[PDB]
Design a protein around this ligand. Structure first.
Ligand SMILES: *[C@@H]1O[C@H](CO)[C@@H](O[C@@H]2O[C@H](CO)[C@@H](O[C@@H]3O[C@H](CO[C@H]4O[C@H](CO[C@H]5O[C@H](CO)[C@@H](O)[C@H](O)[C@@H]5O[C@H]5O[C@H](CO)[C@@H](O)[C@H](O)[C@@H]5O)[C@@H](O)[C@H](O[C@H]5O[C@H](CO)[C@@H](O)[C@H](O)[C@@H]5O)[C@@H]4O)[C@@H](O)[C@H](O[C@H]4O[C@H](CO)[C@@H](O)[C@H](O)[C@@H]4O[C@H]4O[C@H](CO)[C@@H](O)[C@H](O)[C@@H]4O[C@H]4O[C@H](CO)[C@@H](O)[C@H](O)[C@@H]4O)[C@@H]3O)[C@H](O)[C@H]2NC(C)=O)[C@H](O)[C@H]1NC(C)=O
Ligand SMILES: CCCCCCCC/C=C/CCCCCCCC(=O)O[C@H](COC(=O)CCCCCCCCCCCCCCC)COP(=O)(O)OC[C@@H](O)CO
Ligand SMILES: CCCCCCCC(=O)OC[C@H](COP(=O)(O)O[C@@H]1[C@H](O)[C@H](O)[C@@H](OP(=O)(O)O)[C@H](OP(=O)(O)O)[C@H]1O)OC(=O)CCCCCCC
Ligand SMILES: CCCCCCCC(=O)OC[C@H](COP(=O)(O)O[C@@H]1[C@H](O)[C@H](O)[C@@H](OP(=O)(O)O)[C@H](OP(=O)(O)O)[C@H]1O)OC(=O)CCCCCCC
Ligand SMILES: CCCCCCCCCCCC(=O)OC[C@H](COP(=O)([O-])O)OC(=O)CCCCCCCCCCC
Ligand SMILES: CCCCCCCCCCCCCCCC
Ligand SMILES: CCCCCC
Ligand SMILES: [Cl-]
Ligand SMILES: [Cl-]
Ligand SMILES: [Cl-]
Lengths: 353, 332, 344, 352, 345
């Protein structure tokens, strides 16, 4: 049997090993090198201000107690032996009940080099806080953070560093994107120190930059509002004696704008400030209500309740007929031009920034 | 190793089933709390979420040791080996610790026997809300904790002066509420199992009305203003003013229906309900005005000037009602 | 002295057999129980269940755990409960339950010098409660929690309420937005299964629904729409567009209200009390529209015939409108009086 | 001592026992007698095509290694000792996510008779798949299955049987009903063999027969549609000169039918075929457009734009429009056809 | 075949067994043959972009340490022995959530054979990600895959293969999804290069075709019928402004409501779907129908007095415009339907 030597080496590895103590205790500071491979950037939840990310999290350190000699250079350790060895107690500061995958077996691995170098990899699904400012919604951008560090060990005991330079130490898979209404522009990587009542701790931070895609909201909200505003202006071209028809135009357009405003806010969380979409909806409501007020003003000055018969002739100022309203003729030009100017100003203001 | 032999000696003969000073004096616990964030306030379920670092300090004579090392700093490995207080949150509906990547706990033992034990927790806590002044309501939500099994004669908890502390509240998940302040209290609660020291932290929250102004108040006011346009249309246009009246009435009914979606099914009148009902009364009266005007003008045969009177009366009454309502509910 | 207490506790657990009940060959063990209700969360009509948080305490004597020389009640660490026999109590109608586990398992074990054991748990449990919604929302429900022993019979274990009628406390402090607790009851009996008798305890609550929410949500809108339908009676008969618009709008609004009200709640097959009121309002508005349809038909289909030839009278639209004005409010008021006297 | 022989027997019961091997391995087939007591038939979810059931599951078998002699005739084993012996690896073939209750203690019981007969009872909640064909919805009936058997042992190793006659081995409690829109007519019990890539396995099956209650849908969908159809016909009785009013009738009834059609399928899975309710809604929809098209045709033949004033006289064939003969015929034809259609529909669907 | 002899054999096999070493630790790679029996595919979700799948997952591999003689039958052992034996570190790469069923016991199978072959079976339900391209929705076809990989072992240690070839996966033909139909399934075996070393990989892919029957009843027919409803306006006289305006306003608002309501039950994708194109076309049709009457009314009541004072269809005659609309609107709608259905189907 050629496998007895390996069993002998594995049996004697943990002789006198105390896993309650970090490596190099009382002699130096434990050095942990970390790197992250994001296999997919999960969906972003605006209602919860949370985002999901599935990662391969790799840590590496040195433990002189676990040195060995033999024909083999690297030893793989099973889960039972890995639980009997000290490992860093890394945790995510802004975590929201992440999950460690356990199908078919615990998706983690521990390797030991002959010189005492430990490599420890695991597969995680991290849900993390991404607080948002939705003032520029739906044309806003965010920088979602991911911060992690040791829970119990201060900077005088355990310190974290990036394996490569910080830019290249977090690698995102090319095909690993699960975003529907966002674009991952890039990431920034940094490290620092955080104070607390228990002491000073090392923190490793990664910001992911996201930009919202406006395509869904253009179809959902903006275009119906524009069509409603255009529809309200069609009433200017009807004869002033069609009182019920123009009233129907006004009331139906106002009701449609109210319904659109109510439906539009269902996407966001219930924030207590106005977004960019709210201003657009408010201006469109103002235009529709102004069109109805214009009809009311026109109806105020209408004298006769009957329309033009069809056969009679109207002289210049027997049976007489109402004249075409001057308010209607001016409104036909004023309303579309002002709405177009407002659209130009709005889209220039919000898209450029 | 020096630390290994010390740890082995401390655990020799230790019995974690027993308190420190089991039959001498009560065990005094000093508590401390760092609030990472106060999650959303779920008004429907009468609960709120909170994330904390919770720390407890006490003395154990069994863990004294003499050595050049003044303090042992340890991860969660030794937590299950020594006696720990059985602290629990009385008003908690659902609580959980954190276990990624490892258990988020920390232990520290000093040479004089002082033990510090900290852990990260996420708690859903019930908060009964009185919504009579909704959406201008303020609440004081508690978070209570005590020992489950040990009465006041055996464990006593205590605050560490500046005990409860908070970080950057701007990053919190509060949207409908703004954090005003907090306070702490301690008391004795009597149960069938004995008397227990119960310690509470009250967080004061004040609702932000900006969302509801956009959602309910402005649309209802706009519909009420729309109902007044009927007073300027010719009285001979019977279908037009009738259409205005029915459209305003239906839209107000729909707005009334959807205004209550966020709230729970309380059985009393909130401040929003009064506003919606008054708007309904005004639009209904606007329709009834044209009904009586039409009946007296045509169907049946100062009354003819009813539109002129209404043009002044309705906006003035609406403004007066708004002034009284807002002055009563905001200042007084 | 901790050394003496440690020695006594070690003596008690040495030789203890967890597989045998306190009096294995003797009379049955009398297990007293009491409950402290912490909260009653949502009572769901859709799921036909209710959630209950409680402190559940059991009391029983064990001679093997008696100790002497220590005049104290030894409150031990909760982990030692795994080393002692405890009753195999369970709940028949429970669907999902758990013991709270922060910061530690919310479990108490306390010994007394005479061998008495007090065993406490903090339990949140969802329990089934089938509801009869025929009188909804003017209905009362009776929701129960049953407590039984899984394995033992009356020859081995006996249950009783510790403190009699005062066993369950904290009920008066409960408040629900939608319900009001009017009464709670305790029952103890022995269910005679085929294989002997099994002890049973039962905690019942009687819940009465609050009507105030539904008055604002459904009843007042329906009444207001029905009153709106009567405005057509004061419009001139020849204004067909306005009266038809009123009638059609009111009818469709009543249908919409009924549908949206019935969207919630489970898909029960029978008619609720609210459905009766909504159907009555629908009938009233439909009759209001049919009134103008009849008036218009009478005018524009009998006037030419009556002129050529030459309860109210059927040949005068004004008389029909006046009769409707008098009769519709009175009939609606009578219907409301009959409805509200029957269900209250 | 009185309570020492029991401890001695319990200690000596497990000496030399190997729980990795089934009873009679390599000598005979292990026979398991099974029975079920349904404490409550849980709700049925049409959208997910599944149902919940709460059961007491009883299994019984023989283990000659565990026979004993003593004053007692039957012994009870706690959860730890129950975990130290062999038990069947029974599982539900169509189960989705089952639960074994353990409040306050594990809801399990293990009893051993002196001859070596083991009785093992558990309390379970099982969510099981019930595929449904909804062509006759809401007048449809289903037979939801519950299948179980050994996961690892083939028919040559483990076989299951019913403790009594198969009909009498599954007992449903009288009060155990949590169904809201279904009636449990009965059940049928059977057993069989199933082939798979690993071998042949015994399967024990119970089909529960359910019939949907039509009361909810009659109020929810059918009555609004019938009222809408009746409403659309009322326009036939108004004078032909009221052009806006009859147009309002037509458009509003069309919108109501469209909304009802959209909302009818809300509480159903997205099946690719038409149910019985769809045909009813479609016929009502066709009736409403028939009424509106009738009004359009009537309006096409109207000459004068003014109705008959109350004072004038209409000479027999200032002139006035006569009552349309399309309206006079439509006043009876539309109700008659709708009544005949309802008779045929409710006759052919209520006894299918 | 006495139990005592089998007990002796089983004790002998597990004595000195090292769970930490693979079966051929010093030798060539150990070949693991996998096969799957699909029990059901439950919830294909566009909102979450994933699908749920329940299966019996079996792995076969030869272990010379476990070879036994004398007993001529295959030994099915209690499932708890799996913890005492080496098993492959297999995992699913695109898994979001999964578990092994655990009632009445852990649904796990260990079977040994005289030559040392080990069969290890698990009943697993898995939620797996599937990013769906919804441009042609609801006339779309989706490709959803399950990837199987080894966490720590490279090709030098473990090899994967589908045992039985194309027949490795079973039960696909018996699945009945209400919204989809399984057109094809494929098995792929390959070696990925994630670093300096090759890793085995297996892939089970399915191609799903969506059923159009639900959408025909839900979306297409109501929109077509509303579009047909608008054309009734062309048969009414020009002077009946209330009726025609009511008809047009009702049609356009109903189309807007349908379009808004439909899209809320799907993820907020930024691009235009096939259903959106049809709804937008119907909206444009009803909008043009209303603008037709607006133009007719304007022509009459704003160029009749001027033309009388002064003194494609003919722009002066309102009736000619109406008749032209009667002929042209159905024809154009039919042409649009033809072009739409030919392009996507
Ligand atoms: C009804 O039936 C239920 C189902 O059967 C039943 O449920 C369970 O109860 C048991 C006991 O009460 C629970 O077990 C405790 O669980 C703790 C962890 O809890 C969380 O995690 C589990 C999932 O857990 C595993 O996963 C965690 C990570 O989450 C790992 O940390 C664990 O090691 C373990 O590992 C595997 O899986 C991982 C992937 O998940 C892999 O990555 C990993 O590699 C492992 O393979 C969740 O399920 C929990 O959720 C639930 O529970 C909470 C609270 O109740 C609920 O709020 C929530 O909603 C969920 O319902 C939770 O999230 C364990 O830490 C704990 O084990 C400790 O203590 C015991 C002694 O009591 C020790 O024997 C044990 O070794 C553990 O610790 C030692 O370790 C601690 C911590 O480091 C030390 O402080 C201590 O001193 C001690 O150290 C000593 O010994 C070590 C031995 O090796 C040594 O190494 C040390 O160096 C030292 O010397 C315990 O297992 C279980 O979680 C419940 N839930 C389930 C699903 O089983 C329920 O009780 C029944 N109820 C009734 C009334 O009958
Ligand atoms: C139910 C109603 C039905 C109405 C339908 C009527 C039919 C006619 C309409 C067709 C709509 C066309 C839909 C266009 C596709 C939807 C919008 C879209 O996705 O295009 C983007 C540009 O958007 C943008 O510039 C944002 C701005 C576009 C705003 C367009 C509105 C023009 C309003 C002018 C005022 C006129 C007033 C009238 C005055 C006379 C492309 O960006 P890019 O690929 O880089 O992705 C980056 C990231 O932002 C996601 O896109
Ligand atoms: C919110 C309050 C707003 C108050 C606005 C108050 C607006 C205001 O001052 O109205 C007066 C007038 C109404 O004009 P309009 O054409 O509607 O009405 C004609 C006007 O009244 C003539 O005076 C009448 O002739 P006459 O004298 O009897 O011989 C003629 O009678 P008939 O020939 O039909 O029999 C009427 O039809 O409007 C403007 O000219 C302003 C155009 C630009 C207005 C701005 C447009 C954007
Ligand atoms: C169930 C359907 C029943 C239809 C049965 C069909 C019943 C049927 O035969 O009606 C004929 C109908 C028009 O009849 P309707 O009564 O509507 O119109 C009268 C008719 O045009 C007379 O000819 C006119 O008299 P005159 O001599 O010119 O002076 C009379 O004018 P006046 O007296 O006002 O001056 C008009 O009122 O023309 C069709 O094409 C109907 C297509 C039916 C399509 C049906 C669409 C659904
Ligand atoms: C299941 C199949 C049922 C079919 C039953 C059909 C019976 C009713 C059909 C109409 C028959 C009829 O014309 O006589 C009704 C009388 C006299 O009418 P006329 O022919 O002399 O103009 O005129 C009247 O007095 C009738 C009252 C009309 C009131 C207007 C509203 C009618 C509501 C219509 C409901 C669909
Ligand atoms: C935080 C203070 C908010 C004060 C209200 C801001 C209103 C901004 C205009 C948005 C109006 C809603 C859209 C129109 C609804 C018909
Ligand atoms: C503000 C709207 C004015 C309309 C023209 C008088
Ligand atoms: Cl996203
Ligand atoms: Cl909030
Ligand atoms: Cl049901």
């Amino acid at each position: 049997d050629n496998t007895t030597v390996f069993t002998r080496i594995l049996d004697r590895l943990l002789d006198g090993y105390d896993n309650r103590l970090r490596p190099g205790l009382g002699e130096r500071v434990t050095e942990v090198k970390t790197d992250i491979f994001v296999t997919s950037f999960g969906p972003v939840s605006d209602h919860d201000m949370e985002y999901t990310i599935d990662v391969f999290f790799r840590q590496s350190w040195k433990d002189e107690r676990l040195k060995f000699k033999g024909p083999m250079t690297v030893l793989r350790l099973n889960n039972l032996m890995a639980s009997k060895i000290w490992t860093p107690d890394t945790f995510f500061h802004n975590g929201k009940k992440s999950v460690a995958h356990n199908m078919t077996m615990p998706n983690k691995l521990l390797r030991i080099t002959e010189d005492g170098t430990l490599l420890y990899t695991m597969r995680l699904t991290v849900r993390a806080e991404c607080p948002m400012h939705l003032e520029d919604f739906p044309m806003d951008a965010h920088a979602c953070p991911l911060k992690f560090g040791s829970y119990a060990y201060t900077r005088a005991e355990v310190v974290y560093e990036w394996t490569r330079e910080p830019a290249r130490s977090v690698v995102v898979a090319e095909d690993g994107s699960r975003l529907n209404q966002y674009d991952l522009l890039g990431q920034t990587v940094d490290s620092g120190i955080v104070q607390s009542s228990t002491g000073e701790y090392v923190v490793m931070t990664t910001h992911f930059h996201l930009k919202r895609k406006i395509g869904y909201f253009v179809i959902q909200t903006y275009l119906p509002c524009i069509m409603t505003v255009i529809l309200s202006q069609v009433s200017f071209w009807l004869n002033r004696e069609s009182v019920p028809a123009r009233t129907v135009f006004g009331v139906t357009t106002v009701l449609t704008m109210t319904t659109l405003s109510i439906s539009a806010r269902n996407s966001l969380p219930k924030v207590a400030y106005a977004t960019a979409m709210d201003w657009f909806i408010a201006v469109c409501y103002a235009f529709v209500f102004s069109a109805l007020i214009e009809f009311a003003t026109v109806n105020y000055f209408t004298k006769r309740g009957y329309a033009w018969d069809g056969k009679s002739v109207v002289p210049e100022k027997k049976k007489t007929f109402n004249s075409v309203s001057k308010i209607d003729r001016l409104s036909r030009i004023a309303f579309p031009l002002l709405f177009g100017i407002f659209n130009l100003v709005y889209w220039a203001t919000y898209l450029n920034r | 190793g020096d630390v290994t032999v010390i740890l082995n000696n401390l655990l020799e003969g230790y019995d974690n089933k027993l308190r420190p000073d089991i039959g001498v004096k009560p065990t005094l616990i000093h508590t401390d709390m760092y609030v990472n964030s106060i999650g959303p306030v779920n008004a429907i379920n009468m609960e709120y979420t909170i994330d904390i670092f919770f720390a407890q300090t006490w003395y154990d004579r069994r863990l004294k040791f003499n050595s050049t090392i003044k303090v042992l700093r340890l991860n969660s490995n030794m937590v299950g080996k020594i006696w720990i207080p059985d602290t629990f949150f009385r008003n908690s509906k659902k609580a959980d610790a954190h276990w990624i990547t490892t258990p988020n706990r920390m232990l520290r033992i000093w040479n004089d026997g002082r033990v510090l034990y900290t852990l990260r927790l996420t708690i859903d806590a019930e908060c009964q809300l009185q919504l009579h002044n909704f959406p201008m309501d303020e609440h004081s939500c508690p978070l209570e904790f005590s020992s489950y099994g040990y009465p006041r004669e055996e464990i006593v908890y205590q605050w560490k002066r500046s005990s409860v502390e908070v970080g950057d509240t701007r990053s919190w998940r509060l949207y409908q509420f703004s954090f005003v302040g907090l306070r702490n209290t301690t008391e004795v609660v009597k149960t069938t199992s004995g008397d227990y020291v119960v310690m509470s932290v009250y967080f004061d929250l004040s609702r932000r009305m900006g969302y509801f102004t956009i959602q309910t108040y402005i649309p209802c006011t706009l519909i009420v203003v729309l109902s007044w346009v009927s007073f300027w249309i010719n009285k001979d246009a019977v279908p037009a003013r009738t259409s205005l009246g029915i459209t305003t009435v239906l839209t107000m009914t729909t707005l009334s229906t959807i205004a209550r979606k966020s709230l729970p099914k309380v059985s009393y009148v909130t401040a929003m309900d009064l506003f919606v009902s008054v708007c309904f009364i005004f639009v209904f009266s606007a329709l009834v005005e044209y009904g009586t005007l039409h009946y007296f003008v045509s169907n049946r045969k100062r009354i003819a000037k009813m539109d002129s009177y209404a043009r002044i009366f309705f906006p003035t009454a609406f403004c007066l009602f708004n002034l009284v309502y807002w002055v009563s509910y905001l200042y007084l | 002295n901790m050394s003496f207490v440690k020695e006594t506790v070690d003596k008690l657990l040495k030789g203890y057999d967890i597989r045998l009940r306190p009096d294995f060959g003797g009379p049955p063990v009398c297990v007293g129980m009491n409950i402290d209700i912490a909260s009653i969360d949502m009572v769901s009509e859709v799921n036909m269940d209710y959630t209950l948080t409680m402190y559940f305490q059991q009391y029983w004597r064990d001679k093997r755990l008696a100790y002497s020389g220590i005049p104290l009640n030894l409150t031990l660490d909760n982990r030692v409960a795994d080393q002692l026999w405890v009753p195999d109590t369970y709940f028949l109608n429970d669907k999902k339950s758990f013991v709270h586990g922060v910061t530690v398992k919310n479990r108490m074990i306390r010994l007394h010098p005479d061998g008495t054991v007090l065993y406490g748990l903090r339990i949140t449990t969802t329990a089934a409660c089938m509801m009869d919604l025929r009188r909804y929302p003017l209905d009362e429900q009776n929701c129960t929690l049953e407590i039984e022993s899984y394995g033992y019979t009356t020859d081995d274990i006996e249950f009783y309420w510790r403190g009699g009628d005062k066993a369950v406390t904290g009920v008066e402090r409960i408040e629900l937005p939608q319900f009001s607790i009017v009464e709670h009851r305790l029952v103890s009996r022995n269910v005679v299964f085929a294989t002997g008798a099994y002890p049973r305890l039962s905690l019942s609550f009687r819940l009465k629904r609050n009507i105030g929410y539904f008055i604002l949500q459904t009843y007042m809108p329906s009444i207001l729409i029905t009153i709106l339908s009567w405005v057509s009676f004061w419009i001139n008969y020849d204004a067909s567009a306005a009266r038809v618009a009123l009638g059609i709008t009111t009818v469709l609004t009543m249908t919409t209200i009924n549908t949206h009200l019935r969207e919630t709640l489970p898909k029960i097959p029978y008619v609720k009390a609210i459905d009766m009121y909504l159907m009555g309002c629908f009938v009233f508005v439909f009759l209001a529209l049919l009134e103008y349809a009849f008036v218009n038909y009478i005018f524009f289909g009998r006037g030419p015939q009556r002129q050529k030839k030459l309860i109210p009278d059927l040949t005068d639209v004004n008389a029909i409108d006046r009769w409707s004005r008098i009769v519709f409010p009175f009939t609606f008021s009578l219907f409301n009086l009959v409805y509200w006297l029957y269900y209250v």
